[PDB]
Each structure stands twice: as C-alpha cells, then as structure tokens.
A = this chain, B = another copy of it.
C-alpha cells in the first residue's frame, strides 16, 4: 500500500546520513493515527557495533519544551494558572527586574513565546545587541558543558536570576532556555507537586512509556551513544555533561514511537472539534479545542529559525497556508519543532490533512501525518528531510 514512498524516504535518509556523516539515524512515520513505518540505519554504539533499532533511546533536546506546554495547558484548563499575572506571584525567589529605570512586568505568556529579556548562554550584551541590530537591518559556550547536579528548579534558578535583562519584555524576540527553567519552576509552584512526577503522569496518560529524564546512574536499556567530529576530521565521543539544570528545556530521552504518539494525540485534539458536529460517538481530545487552536496560532514579531516562513507559537513552529499570487507557490500548513544538543539532532513534524465535504462526514480523526527523526550527531538540520518525507507519504494517500 505504501511500497513506493518507503524507498524514496530511505533514499532521502541515506542522502542526509552521507552528507552529514552521522553513524546512525532512526525514523518513524505515522499516517492516519497508526504507525506505518519505523526504520534505523547505522550503529547506535560505534565502539561495540550495536545497530540502530526502532527501540533505540536518544536525546530530544528542544522538543521537550513542547511537552512542557502540554503540562501548562492542563494547569491552564483547571484554572490554577493565569498567563497575565506577573511570574513573581508564584515564585518570589525571582528578583523584581527593572529596565532603564522603569518597572516592567514579566508574565508567563511572554516566557512561553520567548518575548521576555532573558539571556541564552551568552553574557556579552554588546555582541547580542550587535547581532540583533544586524538582523533588524553557539556550541563554544561554557555553560553548555556543566557537570553540577541540581536538586530542584529553585537551585537551578541561581544561574541567571542575578543577570540583568537584555531587552524590554514584549518587544524583542530572543530564543532562550532559562525562560523554560522559570516555567518549570512556575509549574512546580502552581501544581503543588514536583515537575518530574507531573511529567511522568502526563507520559502515563499519553502512553509514552520509554520517555524519561537523562541520568547516569539508572540503567536505561538501549541507550545510544553520542559523537562529534574533532579538528582533525575524526570521530570522537562528546564530553560527559549533566543536564539537571534544564529538564524542561533540554533534558529528556525518548524513542520515535513516543513522539509519534504525542503528535497523534495533538492532531486528534486539534481536529476533533470539526468532526464533533457530525457524530457523537467520538471520544474527547486530551486538551480542549480552544486550547489546541491557541497553541498553533502564530504570535507576531517572532522568527522561526528552521524555516523563514514560519512563526513561533507556544513552543511550536507553525507555517500557515496562503497563496498570494495565482499559479504560484501554495504554502502548506504544518507545525514542526527542531532540537539540537551535544551529539544529538532531532525533528518532530506534524502535517495536518486538509478536510473536504465528504471527509468530515465519512472519515474519523486523526487525519494527517507525523514524522519523527533522531540521529546521534551534532549540528544537523533535519527539518527539510522530514518535510520531504511527509509530502512523499501524503502524495499516495489511498
């Protein structure tokens, strides 16, 4: 049924693997709510010659932020968390900040879309200001290779609380991870329980059993190794790192199946609202339809790094549908997030299917494609390959 798109997808995977040089890569493609392809090429452990399998466990670096949003959404739906109020209500430990001698409010909504003025692994404000001015017209950092073990989010707040702001909140978009550490602290304070157990409950609800936080001591089966090329153009192991300070922003281990399930749940929650009118035998989504349409609504004055046409909206990169000129390029609406860490690259992409008159009456949610790719290599851009694979699978729907 899908014997043609599989070969093209494998060819594209070989293309990207050969161009980059990654020792291993794993892909998972799910169509219409069911997993239809899982593949792994290369070695998960070069030293011991362990081949890549669909149950290989790797690092999802920036995709974790998306998961955080879900938790926040749940805390929003119960009404326990309000986006408008300043963040000092929940966490007094965060000092009151001032910009150019005036009071400026820092809110949860600003943190979610990276509209505050928190820094991102950089301290020289002049370089950041010059970069932003040039734009208007990162692996060399030392904080990336921290080794200290932090007990909780409060202990990790000390890394950036004393630094001054870089821009007036709500005015300039600056991608940063410490804002999501603050978000995790807010989640801990508002929920009343620890962040890790809340995330574990969410994982249990969504049926993502393999997902877990990265730690050295526990024994985690099928854990992959991470590699990088050195100055002499030779493969070597990345330095040992500890990610206990950025749980919500950069630390989580998972396979492709869990990401496929997460994408399918998001797609069903998004699309069930339209089908609800036709039939009443459909189960409710995980989140309310208003929350789901709030997540994927682009926020103005934002940039999305991995494709120029997109905009950033609630830990997601959303590309809308438009055709400004006749017989010209027709943009396809989709939502993707890309993650990169020390010796690890990943992409999660959701391509919803456009709905017609008969589709809403006859078909059943979900209707779309989810593509997840993970490789144990550093500084690899996987968005375009995922988009091409999704389009290839979408071409021959039936």
Binding site for B on A (CB under 8 A): 11, 14-15, 18-21, 23, 33, 43-50, 147, 204-207, 216-223, 229-230, 233-237, 239-240, 261, 264-265, 267-269, 272, 282-286, 323-330, 365-366, 379
Contact = CB atoms under 8 A, between A and B. Distances in A.
Nearest to A308: B204
Contacts of A286: 325, 327-328
Contacts of A327: 33, 261, 264-265, 267-269, 285-286, 365-366
- Copy number in the complex reads 4
A20 B234 contact: yes
A14 B43 CA distance: 10
Contacts of A325: 205, 265, 268, 283-286
A48 B48 contact: yes
Nearest to A45: B48
The residue among A269, A272, A328 with the most chain B CB atoms within 10 A of its own CB is A328
11 contacts: A18-B23, A21-B21, A48-B223, A205-B324, A205-B329, A216-B237, A216-B239, A261-B327, A286-B327, A326-B365, A326-B366
Contacts of A285: 325-327
Contacts of A220: 47
A376 to B, nearest CB: 12
Contacts of A328: 205-207, 265, 286
A234 B381 CA distance: 12
A235 B48 contact: no
B216 A11 contact: no
Given A283-B326, A327-B365, 5 more contacts: A15-B46, A47-B221, A48-B48, A240-B240, A286-B325
Nearest to A207: B329
A217 B237 contact: yes
B48 A268 contact: no
A365 B327 CA distance: 9
B206 A329 contact: yes
A48 B323 contact: no
B268 A49 contact: no
A19 B283 contact: no
Contacts of A261: 327
A225 to B, nearest CB: 9
A366 to B, nearest CB: 6
A43 B285 CA distance: 44
B47 A223 contact: yes
A43 B18 contact: yes
Contacts of A240: 216, 240
A210 to B, nearest CB: 12
B272 A222 contact: no
Contacts of A265: 325, 327-328
Contacts of A45: 45, 48, 50
Q: A50, A229, A265, A325 — which one has the most chain B CB atoms within 10 A of its CB?
A: A325
A45 B379 CA distance: 25
Contacts of A206: 328-329
Given A284-B326, A327-B265, A222 B21 contact: no
Given A268-B326, A327-B264, A221 B15 contact: yes
Contacts of A23: 18
Nearest to A51: B48
A329 B262 CA distance: 11
